[PDB]
Amino acid sequence: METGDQRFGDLVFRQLAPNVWQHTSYLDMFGAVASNGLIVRDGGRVLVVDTAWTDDQTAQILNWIKQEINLPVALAVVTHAHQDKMGGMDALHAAGIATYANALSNQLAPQEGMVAAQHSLTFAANGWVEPATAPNFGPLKVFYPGPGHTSDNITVGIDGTDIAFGGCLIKDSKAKSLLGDADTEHYAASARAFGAAFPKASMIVMSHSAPDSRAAITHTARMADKLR
Ligand SMILES: SC[C@H]1SC[C@@H]2Nc3ccccc3N21
Ligand SMILES: [Zn+2]
Ligand SMILES: [Zn+2]
């Protein structure tokens, strides 16, 4: 917890820019483990990146949005099929929110014990989302960097800001380690591809660290170089 953070139930919210917030939820494992996602205000609507670990926690994200922003949530995008990112899908579907994930994330979801998203994103060979599969994503710029943390992991830049979201692919520059589902061969190149896709992002948001500078990307890639 840090100055300027807002506690709402057992969740924490931090404003990162005029129209961007980080949501943080916690699961006991080892102690409490944090997972971060994003909330974006885009005109008269709100966009969400990643659920919380659980449905009840994700419901509280929606309650916080109602109180602090009071705009309808148009869509949510989730960045791979693990519990921290997709554990709360039912809360979104119960609320009528359109949900999006990598097609591979939706294909893996049943095996991972997750509820698949309603819609599937596909990607070009250069990693950029096929625009037809990302309808009305507004400032959310979705990029598939290649296999790393998982084979399905995706990343999201926030257009009009200096923020890019690396999900669980990127760790901060103080991390000592990065891998059960991981592609250790391609991880380093995937980390570097994320950096090259969002070359002007100066605030890197990630799932299990507080926001960091671009050094988080390079430090992560150099740690991943050692896995090969
Ligand atoms: S990246 C998916 C999440 S869900 C359970 C597993 N173990 C773990 C431990 C610490 C941080 C994150 C994690 N992961
Ligand atoms: Zn994961
Ligand atoms: Zn994670």
Q: How many domains does the chain fold into? A: 1
What kind and span of H or E run contains 15? strand 11-17
**What is the distance between the alpha carbons of residues 100 and 138, in angstroms, rounded to a whole number?**
14
Q: Which domain holds residue 8?
A: 1-228
Method used experimentally: X-ray
* Candidate of 35, 51, 83, 84 to mutate for ligand 1, largest count of ligand atoms within 8 Å of Cβ: 84
Cα→Cα distances 188→40, 45, 220, Å? 29, 36, 8
Neighbours of 195 (CB within 10 A): 21
Strand ranges across the sheet with 155-158: 140-143, 155-158, 163-167, 203-206
Q: Running DSSP on this structure, what letter comes out for residue 140?
A: E
The bound ligand whose nearest atom lies closest to the alpha carbon of 87 is: 1
**What is the distance between the alpha carbons of residues 196 and 194, in angstroms, rounded to a whole number?**
5
CB of 76 within 8 A of CB of 99? yes
Q: Name, in order, each residue with C-beta under 8 angstroms of 72's C-beta and a sequence gap of 6 or more.
A: 44, 45, 46
Which ligand 1 atom is nearest residue 207's CA?
1
Residue the block writes with tokens 């979104």:
92
Q: Kindly tell me the sign of the dihedral angle through the C-alpha atoms of 62, 63, 68, 69.
A: positive
Tokens of 191: 């980390």
Q: What are φ and ψ of residue 80, in 5° steps? A: -175, 170
CATH number for the domain harbouring residue 96: 3.60.15.10
**What is the distance between the alpha carbons of residues 209 and 20, in angstroms, rounded to a whole number?**
17
Resolution reading in Å: 1.6
